Amino acid sequence: SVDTMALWLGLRAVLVVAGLAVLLQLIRGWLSSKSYVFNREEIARLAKEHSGLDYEVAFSKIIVELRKKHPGHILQDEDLQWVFVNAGGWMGSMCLLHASLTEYVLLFGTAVDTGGHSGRYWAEISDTILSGTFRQWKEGTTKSEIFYPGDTIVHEVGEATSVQWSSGTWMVEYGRGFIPSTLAFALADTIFSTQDFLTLFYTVKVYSKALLLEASTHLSQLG
Amino acid sequence: SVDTMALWLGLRAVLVVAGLAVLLQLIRGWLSSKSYVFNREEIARLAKEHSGLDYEVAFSKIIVELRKKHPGHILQDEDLQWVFVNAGGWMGSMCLLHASLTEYVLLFGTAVDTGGHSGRYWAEISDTILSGTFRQWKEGTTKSEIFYPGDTIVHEVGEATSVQWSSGTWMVEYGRGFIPSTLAFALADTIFSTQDFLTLFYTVKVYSKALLLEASTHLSQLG
Amino acid sequence: SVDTMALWLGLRAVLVVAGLAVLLQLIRGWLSSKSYVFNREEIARLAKEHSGLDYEVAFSKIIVELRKKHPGHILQDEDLQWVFVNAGGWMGSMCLLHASLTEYVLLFGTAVDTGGHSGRYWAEISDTILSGTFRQWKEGTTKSEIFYPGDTIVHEVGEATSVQWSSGTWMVEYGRGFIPSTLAFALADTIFSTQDFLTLFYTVKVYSKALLLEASTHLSQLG
């Protein structure tokens, strides 16, 4: 039974590889055939439309428009708060409006000069600048590009770049894909640098509120 | 007998929260009751007095004045050394003059442009700029404020901000509260980023020196 | 057996100290008597010679000259790729040309504004600027210095500094000493911040390619 004791070892690894491949293909097929509440072009155009005003007025108008076109998918004013985001070596702030297992919409930006690693996840993230500047340094190149209000950067799936923002840079962010892949990145600098677990609690609270809102909307649609 | 299973846990958690509340009340009352070697106004005025001259001359004059007004509570010239401080995503350097379990005084600053998370501890930290600029971004806002020589930033207890310092920014720092709460923060980037454990040794050394000086001064004053 | 058991601990600790000291002395004596493919002056002069041109033209000419003078010790064009480097709180990009256990040559630089801790390892690292600016802040001082194309920074063994690079700063890097000492540093920010394990894989790939090239060259010299 020495040959069969080794047959288990060989076949168990093949089974693990086949199961992981089947799970990845299943998730990819689900993501390709799923119905989405928002599309990235919608958010990008809505942001470019109000990018000419003050970024706070733009925030207000964009939130109003999002609640009008997609009722039941955006948090109310009593649940909106700015939460610090320390990640990839940079530090900014977010205001989450919607978040599911496959989509999230928020208002991002920083009042200080920061920059770092953009992350590399199984999701596509679009960023439309309302004010400020956004320097992107794509992988495998020696030159970066600066983007201004109105522009939209698309951090593609599986791509990793370097991001840099000047003081007062604010944008509207929409992420689509497998959102939990980002989660770990979003927490790294909080665990091994800032030690700001209170901000971690705030982040957990707002994400939980968005997920519960989406679940309650699904239940209301069913009854 | 099944009801007691969950009754053990349910009231026990309230008792645990009450016990930590009693510990917090004891520590909070001890801080107000405690007599303090320094007050933030004293350090702030002493630093602002010399904020108009060169930052090195200001360092020397402030150290001499502190040794004059509080003998036995400030390290001698043989114990002063600049130690790198990597924390919260920023990098500066410190020279510790005094440190107890509830107070610390030091000269902080950086010769490079840095910035990051300010930390969130159970202590109030006052910073009086001797030279340079200090950008502070408070939590929950979208705009930051720049402070110049003469100004004083008060990192309040439990609040977290974003700090940014330009090249050649130097200040006098006084912290009061529960000092060990900051400790972990002060080491995070050293453990998970810089790997400069020699600087960790230097920091532990100066902290131990200050604590031993404070203990010996207490023993000498008591007898 | 109290007297005997305390005897165990003392001799055990002395044995550990003596063994670690003998290992360190062995490695240092080996490093002092080893033949090296490159010297820092060679790389520094070769980079300063082409420091007047564009950093890409300089890269190509320097690679050509290095492959001409030292054939079989530098990877070919099919193995060269730019890999992101997140370390010490800064983010740049590298292109490795040569790497052994005691030497490494690469082209380093960043297209974004970054800076942080320089690291502290058992190796000397020379950096000859082809373009941009390099701000160095030495340990124990309150002033930094800016260096321009043509200059050479020598990150000495055991010294720790603060580095800062402007957008578009590119240089040629040569490191000599005990290379594994740097290893932890090179991965720290990747494990506890970026979570970009694909870039980790790329780094491992290029390091393995350079090491295998060196091993195959030694075998070819032997036969």
Q: How is A102-159 classified by DSSP, letter by letter? A: SEEEEEEEESS-EEEE----SEEEEEEEEES-EEEE-TT-S--EEE-TT-EEEE-TT-
Mutation for B interface: C162, C169, C191, most B CBs within 10 A = C162
Q: Are C177 and C103 in contact (CB under 8 A)?
A: no
CA–CA separation, C139 vs B115, rounded Å?
A: 19
Q: How was this structure determined?
A: X-ray
Q: Which amino acid is at B174?
A: Y
Q: How long, in residues, is chain B?
A: 223
CA–CA separation, A103 vs A126, rounded Å?
A: 12
CA–CA separation, C35 vs A178, rounded Å?
A: 52
Please indicate whether, in this complex, the C-beta atoms of B167 and C135 are within 8 angstroms of each other.
Answer: yes
∠ CA C63-C65-C69, rounded to 5°: 120
Please count the residue pairs, one from chain A and one from chain B, whose beta carbons lie less than 8 angstroms apart.
83
Helix-helix angle B40-49:B55-69, to 10 degrees: 140
- Among chain B, residues having any CB pair with chain C shorter than 8 Å are 55-56, 81-82, 84, 86, 89-91, 93, 109-114, 167-168, 170, 189, 192-196, 198-199
Q: Which amino acid is at B67?
A: R
**Cβ contacts (< 8 Å) between A107 and chain B: which residues?**
none
Please count the residue pairs, one from chain A and one from chain C, whose beta carbons lie less than 8 angstroms apart.
84
Q: Regarding beta strands B169-177 and B103-110, do their DSSP bridges make them parallel or antiparallel, or are they unpaired?
A: antiparallel
Two structure tokens written together for B205 = 């050394």
Dihedral, CA atoms, A45, A47, A48, A53, nearest 10 degrees?
A: 150
CA–CA separation, A115 vs A127, rounded Å?
A: 15
CA–CA separation, A11 vs A14, rounded Å?
A: 5
Two structure tokens written together for B54 = 């060169």
Residue A118, φ and ψ in degrees, nearest 5? -80, -10
Give the DSSP H or E segment for B210.
helix B197-222
| Nearest residue of B to residue C189, measured between CA atoms | B193
Q: Are B188 and A192 in contact (CB under 8 A)?
A: yes
CA–CA separation, C206 vs C212, rounded Å?
A: 10
What's the farthest any 2 CA atoms get from each other in chain C?
Answer: 75
CA–CA separation, C185 vs C118, rounded Å?
A: 9
Two structure tokens written together for B94 = 């410190």
Which string of DSSP letters, residue by residue, matches B118-178?
----SEEEEEEEEES-EEEEETT-S--EEE-TT-EEEE-TT--EEEEE-TTEEEEEEEEE-
Q: Can you list the positions of beta strands (E) in chain A? A: 83-87, 90-99, 103-110, 114-117, 123-131, 134-137, 145-147, 152-155, 162-165, 169-177
Q: Tell me, what DSSP letter sits at residue B52?
A: T
Q: How many helices (H) and strands (E) does chain A have?
A: 5, 10
Nearest to C172 by CA among C19, C86, C46: C46
> For residue A81, how many C-alpha atoms fall within 13 Å in the half-sphere facing its CB?
15
| Nearest-CB residue to A142 (from C170, C193, C196) | C170
Q: Are C38 and C103 in contact (CB under 8 A)?
A: yes
Which residues have a Cβ under 8 Å from the Cβ of C157 and sit 6 or more positions away? C121, C122, C123, C124, C177
DSSP three-state, residue C44: helix
Nearest to C117 by CA among B191, B208, B182: B191
Mutation for B interface: A56, A82, A84, most B CBs within 10 A = A84
Two structure tokens written together for C201 = 């894989």
Q: Tell me, what DSSP letter sits at residue C52?
A: T
Q: Tell me, what DSSP letter sits at residue C71?
A: T
For residue A108, give how far its alpha carbon lies from the nearest alpha carbon of chain B (Å): 10
DSSP three-state, residue C45: helix
Task: Count Cβ atoms below 10 Å from residue C150 Cβ, excluding itself.
Answer: 14
Q: Are B193 and C117 in contact (CB under 8 A)?
A: yes
For chain A, the distance separating the N- and C-terminal CA atoms, rounded to the nearest angstrom, is 58
Instruction: For CA atoms A30, A35, A41, A45, give the dihedral sign.
Output: negative
Residue A127, φ and ψ in degrees, nearest 5? -135, 115
CA–CA separation, A121 vs C195, rounded Å?
A: 10
Give the sheet arrangement for strand A169-177, strand by strand.
A83-87, A90-99, A103-110, A169-177, A123-131, A152-155
Q: Are B174 and B38 in contact (CB under 8 A)?
A: yes
| Nearest residue of C to residue B95, measured between CA atoms | C140
Q: Are B111 and C142 in contact (CB under 8 A)?
A: yes
Q: Are A187 and C194 in contact (CB under 8 A)?
A: no
CA–CA separation, B176 vs A103, rounded Å?
A: 44
Q: Tell me, what DSSP letter sits at residue B82?
A: -
Instruction: For CA atoms A58, A63, A64, A69, give the dihedral sign.
Output: positive
Burial (CB count <10 Å: 0-12, 13-18, 19+), residue B219: exposed
Q: Regarding beta strands C162-165 and C134-137, do their DSSP bridges make them parallel or antiparallel, or are they unpaired?
A: antiparallel
What's the farthest any 2 CA atoms get from each other in chain B?
Answer: 76
For residue B191, give how far its alpha carbon lies from the nearest alpha carbon of chain C (Å): 9
| Nearest-CB residue to B111 (from C120, C142, C188) | C142
Report CA-CA distances (Å) from C5 to B40, B169, C16, C19, C183.
53, 55, 17, 21, 39
Task: Count Cβ atoms below 10 Å from residue C112 Cβ, excluding itself.
Answer: 23
Burial (CB count <10 Å: 0-12, 13-18, 19+), residue C205: middle
CA–CA separation, A101 vs A96, rounded Å?
A: 14
**Cβ contacts (< 8 Å) between C141 and chain B: which residues?**
82, 111
| Nearest-CB residue to C184 (from B84, B90, B195) | B195
* Neighbors of chain C by Cβ distance (3+ pairs < 8 Å): A, B
B/e letters for A164-199, b = 16+ CB within 10 Å, e = fewer, are: bbbbbbbbbbbbbbbbeebeebbbbbbbbbbbbeeb
Q: Are C117 and C160 in contact (CB under 8 A)?
A: yes
∠ CA A99-A163-A189, rounded to 5°: 65
Which residues have a Cβ under 8 Å from the Cβ of B193 and sit 6 or more positions away? A192, A193, B86, C87, C88, C89, C116, C117, C188, C189, C192, C193
For residue C109, give how far its alpha carbon lies from the nearest alpha carbon of chain B (Å): 18
Report CA-CA distances (Å) from A197 to A203, B27, B131.
9, 21, 32
Q: Are A152 and A44 in contact (CB under 8 A)?
A: yes
| Nearest residue of C to residue A86, measured between CA atoms | C193
Nearest to C115 by CA among A190, B86, A189: B86
* Neighbors of chain A by Cβ distance (3+ pairs < 8 Å): B, C
CA–CA separation, B108 vs B96, rounded Å?
A: 8
For residue C17, give how far its alpha carbon lies from the nearest alpha carbon of chain A (Å): 31
DSSP three-state, residue C193: helix
Strand partners, C84: C93
Q: How long, in residues, is chain C?
A: 223
Which residues have a Cβ under 8 Å from the Cβ of A152 and sit 6 or more positions away? A44, A47, A48, A126, A127, A128, A129
Please indicate whether, in this complex, the C-beta atoms of B160 and A84 are within 8 angstroms of each other.
Answer: yes
Residue A177, φ and ψ in degrees, nearest 5? 145, -140
Q: Tell me, what DSSP letter sits at residue B96?
A: E
CA–CA separation, A191 vs A196, rounded Å?
A: 8
Which residues have a Cβ under 8 Å from the Cβ of B81 and sit 6 or more positions away? B95, B202, B206, C140
Two structure tokens written together for B93 = 């350097």
CA–CA separation, B179 vs B186, rounded Å?
A: 11
B/e letters for A30-48, b = 16+ CB within 10 Å, e = fewer, are: ebeeeeebbebebbbebbb
CA–CA separation, B89 vs A174, rounded Å?
A: 26
Dihedral, CA atoms, A16, A18, A23, A29, nearest 10 degrees?
A: 170
Two structure tokens written together for B110 = 């950086």
Mutation for A interface: B85, B136, B137, most A CBs within 10 A = B137
Q: Are C134 and C126 in contact (CB under 8 A)?
A: no
Two structure tokens written together for B69 = 């007004």
Classify C109 in phi/psi space as left (phi over 0), alpha (psi -120 to 50) or beta: left
**Cβ contacts (< 8 Å) between C90 and chain A: which residues?**
89
Q: Which amino acid is at C80?
A: L
Please indicate whether, in this complex, the C-beta atoms of B117 and A168 are within 8 angstroms of each other.
Answer: no
Q: Are A139 and A119 in contact (CB under 8 A)?
A: no
Strand partners, B127: B153, B173
| Nearest residue of C to residue A161, measured between CA atoms | C84
Q: After which residues is chain A broken (C to N over 2.5 A)?
A: none
Q: Are A135 and A163 in contact (CB under 8 A)?
A: yes
Q: Which amino acid is at B27?
A: I
Please indicate whether, in this complex, the C-beta atoms of C82 and A164 are within 8 angstroms of each other.
Answer: no
| Nearest residue of C to residue A158, measured between CA atoms | C198
CA–CA separation, B119 vs B117, rounded Å?
A: 6
Nearest to B129 by CA among B51, B61, B49, B38: B51
Please indicate whether, in this complex, the C-beta atoms of C185 and B195 are within 8 angstroms of each other.
Answer: yes
Please indicate whether, in this complex, the C-beta atoms of B119 and A195 are within 8 angstroms of each other.
Answer: yes
Report CA-CA distances (Å) from B106 to B80, B98, B111, B151, C162.
10, 7, 16, 17, 20
Please indicate whether, in this complex, the C-beta atoms of B184 and A195 are within 8 angstroms of each other.
Answer: yes
DSSP three-state, residue C127: strand
Which residues have a Cβ under 8 Å from the Cβ of B137 and sit 6 or more positions away? A110, A111, A112, B143, B144, B145, B161, B162, B163, B164
CA–CA separation, C180 vs B35, rounded Å?
A: 51
Q: Tell me, what DSSP letter sits at residue A37?
A: S
Strand partners, B152: B128
Which residues have a Cβ under 8 Å from the Cβ of B160 and sit 6 or more positions away? A84, A194, A196, A198, A199, B117, B118, B119, B120, B139
* Cα R_g (chain A), whole angstroms: 20
Q: Regarding beta strands A103-110 and A114-117, do their DSSP bridges make them parallel or antiparallel, or are they unpaired?
A: unpaired
Classify C72 in phi/psi space as left (phi over 0), alpha (psi -120 to 50) or beta: left
CA–CA separation, C111 vs B49, rounded Å?
A: 42
**Cβ contacts (< 8 Å) between A199 and chain B: which residues?**
120, 160
CA–CA separation, C100 vs C95, rounded Å?
A: 15
Q: Are C5 and C156 in contact (CB under 8 A)?
A: no
Q: Are C130 and C49 in contact (CB under 8 A)?
A: no
CA–CA separation, A104 vs B43, rounded Å?
A: 47
Mutation for A interface: C55, C59, C164, C189, most A CBs within 10 A = C189
For residue B34, give how far its alpha carbon lies from the nearest alpha carbon of chain C (Å): 35
CA–CA separation, A87 vs A92, rounded Å?
A: 9
For the stretch C207-216, contacts whose Cβ atoms lie closer than 8 Å and that sit 24 or more positions apart, written own/partner, are: C207/C96, C207/C99, C209/C75, C209/C79, C210/C75, C210/C96, C210/C97, C210/C98, C210/C99, C210/C100, C210/C104, C211/C99, C211/C100, C211/C101, C213/C72, C213/C73, C213/C74, C213/C75, C213/C98, C214/C73, C214/C98, C214/C99, C214/C100
